């Protein structure tokens, strides 16, 4: 990093943050995908989805 001189910036999202966001997507794919209209949440058991 310094034998030439440059710094690698870490990303804005931390590892726990992608973990939480992907967890939210994995929990919400069953919910949103039942009928159009994103206002409600419809977290059906998955096999029914």
């Amino acid at each position: 990093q310094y034998v030439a001189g440059y710094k690698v910036l870490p990303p804005l999202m931390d590892v726990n943050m992608e973990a939480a966001y992907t967890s939210s997507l994995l929990g919400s794919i069953a919910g949103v995908g039942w009928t159009a209209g994103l206002s409600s949440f419809a977290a059906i058991p998955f096999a029914q989805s």
Binding site: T35, A36, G37, S39
Partner: protein
């Protein structure tokens, strides 16, 4: 506007009973950006950019 709101999963009954409140909310929303033009608008910043 009534038909478009009907299409997104809102029943006719609340539309037929609450015309004035949704009209006032629409007026407030379409007046919000009139006083909104400052640095906080991302689109305004991109136009300036």
């Amino acid at each position: 506007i009534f038909y478009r709101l009907n299409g997104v999963g809102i029943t006719q009954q609340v539309l037929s009973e609450n015309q004035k409140l949704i009209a006032n909310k629409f007026n407030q929303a379409l007046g919000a950006m009139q006083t909104g033009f400052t640095t906080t608008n991302e689109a305004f910043q991109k136009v300036q950019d």
